[PDB]
């Protein structure tokens, strides 16, 4: 039942911009998310001091996906343990406690990819978090699907648009509610030529180039969030990427880089069945 939103697909209602995504299959400069638009959106919350740590996504009733750098990043002296954080699911407002809507879960264990490269280019920027108890699904809490080889091959193409969501900075400035933006996947050569950082096959970049006019990008605080696409084949939402890194936010000539979820699916599956 993954990728089918209770307030949209399940009731045959479309959100205001999903059409833009479909037409392409041939947070800075975003907008307020609609209620129940990204039911898999998760907020990584730091216990003390209470503050936004990163975004994340719900992939089952007991597993949450995020970017490895959100939990481990030596350059900024970041090395969180499971007891240092909380997972807030089903949220819309950034700072308010959404009683009767959101659910706060504790972390049982954190799993960082063994070959995550924090010292150079954030290669394999991915991590899994097992919750102590399963969260109950609702209109505002629902898992997103993970892509299979065919899904990735068909939708991970230059020009095809995905959607990124998060409570991060609005400019390189904090939003009241969850922000959303649809961005086109950019061809590899362009991504590589826009930076001095080495790009790998475990990442893809997205965003508009200066000649396109439109803008948009993830920013600090959005890391760990999902880059999703709605399959035109089965009408389900798939998490194709994880907000990873970018030079600044929404700068002309630059692009946001996302962890290639399918490429690391092997690792994801291994961790899942090995640990419950």
């Amino acid at each position: 039942d993954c990728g089918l939103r209770p307030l949209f697909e399940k009731k045959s209602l479309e959100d205001k911009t999903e059409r833009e995504l479909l037409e392409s299959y041939i947070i800075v400069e975003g907008s307020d998310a609609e209620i129940g638009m990204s039911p898999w959106q998760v907020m990584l919350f730091r216990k003390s001091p209470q503050e936004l740590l990163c975004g994340a996504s719900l992939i089952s009733d007991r597993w949450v996906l995020t970017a490895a750098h959100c939990l481990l990043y030596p350059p900024w002296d970041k090395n969180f343990t499971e007891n240092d954080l909380l997972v807030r699911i089903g949220k819309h407002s950034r700072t308010r406690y959404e009683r009767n809507i959101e659910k706060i879960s504790m972390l049982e264990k954190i799993y960082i990819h063994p070959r995550y490269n924090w010292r150079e280019n954030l290669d394999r920027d991915i991590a899994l978090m097992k919750l102590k108890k399963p969260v109950a699904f609702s209109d505002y809490i629902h898992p997103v699907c993970l892509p299979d080889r065919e899904t990735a091959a068909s939708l991970l193409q230059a020009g095809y648009k995905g959607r990124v969501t998060g409570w991060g900075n609005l400019k390189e400035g904090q939003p009241s509610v969850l922000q959303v933006v649809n961005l086109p996947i950019v061809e590899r050569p362009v991504c590589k030529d826009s930076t001095r950082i080495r790009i790998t096959d475990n990442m893809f970049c997205a965003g508009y180039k200066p000649d396109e006019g439109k803008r948009g990008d993830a920013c600090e605080g959005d890391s760990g969030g999902p880059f999703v696409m709605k399959s035109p084949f089965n009408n389900r939402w798939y998490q194709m990427g994880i907000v990873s890194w970018g030079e600044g936010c929404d700068r002309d000539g630059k692009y946001g880089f996302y962890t290639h979820v399918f490429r690391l699916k092997k690792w994801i599956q291994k961790v899942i069945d090995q640990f419950g």
Partner: peptide, 10 residues
């Protein structure tokens, strides 16, 4: 500037 969550969670 975050509200404050129920004590059970903390």
């Amino acid at each position: 500037d975050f509200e404050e969550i129920p004590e059970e969670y903390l």
